[PDB]
Amino acid sequence: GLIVDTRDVEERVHVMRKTKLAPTVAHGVFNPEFGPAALSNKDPRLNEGVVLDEVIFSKHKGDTKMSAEDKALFRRCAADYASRLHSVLGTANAPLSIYEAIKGVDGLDAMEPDTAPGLPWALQGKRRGALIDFENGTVGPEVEAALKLMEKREYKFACQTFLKDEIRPMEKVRAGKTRIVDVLPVEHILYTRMMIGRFCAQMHSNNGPQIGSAVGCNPDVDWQRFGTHFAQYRNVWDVDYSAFDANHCSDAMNIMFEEVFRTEFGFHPNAEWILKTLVNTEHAYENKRITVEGGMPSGCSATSIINTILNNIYVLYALRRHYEGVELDTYTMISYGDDIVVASDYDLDFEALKPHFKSLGQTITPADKSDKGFVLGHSITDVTFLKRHFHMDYGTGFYKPVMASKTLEAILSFARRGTIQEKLISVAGLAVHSGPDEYRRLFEPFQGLFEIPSYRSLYLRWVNAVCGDAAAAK
Amino acid sequence: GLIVDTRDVEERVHVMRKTKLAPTVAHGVFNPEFGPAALSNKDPRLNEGVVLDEVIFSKHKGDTKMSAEDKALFRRCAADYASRLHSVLGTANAPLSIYEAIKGVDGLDAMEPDTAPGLPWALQGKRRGALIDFENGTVGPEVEAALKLMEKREYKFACQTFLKDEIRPMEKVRAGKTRIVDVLPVEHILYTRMMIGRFCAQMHSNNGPQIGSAVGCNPDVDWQRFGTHFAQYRNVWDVDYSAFDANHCSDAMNIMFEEVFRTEFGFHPNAEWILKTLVNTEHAYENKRITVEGGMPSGCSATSIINTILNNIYVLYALRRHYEGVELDTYTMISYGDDIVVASDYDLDFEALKPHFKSLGQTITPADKSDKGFVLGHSITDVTFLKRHFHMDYGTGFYKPVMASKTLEAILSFARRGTIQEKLISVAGLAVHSGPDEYRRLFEPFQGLFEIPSYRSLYLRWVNAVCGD
């Protein structure tokens, strides 16, 4: 987006400046080219000339004002995608009750009782649990007062800027490429879930290429469904975006909100309004209040779903801007936020689409670094999606999600103190798909120090999960 | 071309025809897969279901319609080649006089005094001498009257079709694929020479890759010139056409005549007209009159030059139809009728040009039949032109024209009765370039029966010819 104002204020919004991610026994074995993101400007690992406070906001390079022609094309593409979406999901998009929004429904997880509450509550020393009863699904007077202002479209707010404490490639760490989490007020998250929670639940439950969304998928079971689909097409492309979320222009966000979240599709009138509050945002970081026009705040209630919807519309828009006679059946795709797999029996020229994505303020490149240009004839077994390859399992013939061994090494090499046993069992579920030899190697540093699930136990659990999903379908 | 009509006529042409060719003592040694063409439907060598008088015309399978876009491209290619051609030759293309046309000029041989006169003269038992005085270069009243009809563009004529008495592959012999020659009326040949005779003389004088024509060349002396030129290029192709002459479409022929023989290039306006009389023709064969639209009559005046001009335009057309930014400098070529060598530093995809030549009704294949596909990186020492390879002579450092030993064996295996000694001395001039061992082997069958020139004598004669040029 475009930074239109940066001012200093009295009340400092403090930031965590020390990582909680300590090296494990595995770190000394794997010596990974990964480490915790820099959380301080004084981090000695940062390259000469890197100012952390500047680099973390450098993604804000402007808000593309789209041409009359392009806004008209974008609107018809958003309407065509919405028609497909609401045809598959239906139009039962009535608001969730306060209770449903807190507790969740079929296809939507409950709200987190003890995550950051956002502003102004963080400055008042108030936790989420002081504002909302998560057990009984009721709100206190402070949240109820804010919900009244949202009903009347008078609610205003600031986003709280958190640096994301996480493992990154060391090249990105040294460059000061620490990622930001935008924490919105808990009441804003609650009202968003009331307005579009049912729709999000339906999106999760109906994930697949037909709606172009993998949000809410289970890679263990759904890799077989996704893999079998994409295996049937002559050409497959995985596309990398540069700062996808930051580069959503006001025009694209506003037009998408207008076409997807219409009252005629069963939404409360304030569905469009609460989403439009994300376009022009104030960001609190230390003593800085930064006003940004355009871009999706990174970590709102429906960030993944909103990013996925925009990704689907961007592909239809780009193809229609380059080609005559492009329809939703010209290609197939699945997206999870900025992540995307596209396929077609047509020899689509993805290199030629680069300037068409640029008209939306988006920069696309091949996810593969064999070439800086897009090429034809790639298959589902060449692409990365959610950091996972599609590999055919020898034992079953099922597609399984395989992560890069170097990435699994990096994940195993760091942990928050007292979480190693828990993390090992979690990562075991990811590593099983690398096969028995790689599984053994990855967990060998932990042998006799922690419980490591048997390869066989996790393999059988996986086979049963895919087979159970197939037996259900029959 | 399209055969639009076939009808039986009472004023028939020929009688029962036998070959003048007989085997030589070489036939039994070399056993060539070649023999005299069938000249009779009753030839016992002919396959079942062969009708000779039909097969000889079977090349006429239609007159290809070119799209408006292809016609426009062809006209630009014809104009662009004409521009290069007349830049080299100049525009001194004024009509010859009757005298000059009969007697010839510098670069144009005199007309033949006693060859076939054509129709209707042949049926009236007239020879060329009864119509034209060749010694004094004057015409009688019959030819004078015909010339006046041509001035008025009212002249009409039939082509007299003769079978070609010659050696053919035995496959072609058995299939009844005897080649034909069209004898046009002597006055038509006369007027054609009057209209484009100076041009044809300049074509002969300036033969070479710059005008893309080898017509009038002397392979003995000119292979050095041609070989040196083509040796400079990364890629060389030799291209084979199927029935090149027959498959010139009316669209292509008319546009070529209109762009090459323009009055602004110094031609009389009837140069275009007399050439356009070749497009829609009547052919007299025995008792048959066959009307054809499209194709070149094989053996009209300037057949070789016309076919060569079309070959040049076809290559520019095909390359420009496939590729962006093609000009005359993109490639080089030389042609003799359907025979062609093309070269370029560009890796031109000749396989991809196949459909582009097909838009002209022409079917191209590699001249090298050891593969049905065109390839890159062939050189001048790989290709065949006028049945001759380009070999570097060790003794001189000059290119020499080398015929395949199988070609020379076939040539030596037959001769017109009473001509063997004359033929052997002629063929010795072709065979010397194969080197002393192959020269000795080729003439071994004739030793003690005929005088065979020494390899040494013909080699020294050749050295003088190329050093003299």
Binding site: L319, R321, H322, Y323, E324, G325, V326, T330, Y346, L348, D349, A352 | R321, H322, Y323, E324, G325, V326, T330, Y346, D347, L348, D349, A352
Partner: peptide, 17 residues
């Protein structure tokens, strides 16, 4: 199928080397 919007009616190859 899908045809380009800005292509001319001369779909001709570039000269190689």
């Amino acid at each position: 199928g899908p045809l380009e919007r800005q292509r001319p009616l001369k779909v001709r190859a570039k000269l190689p080397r």
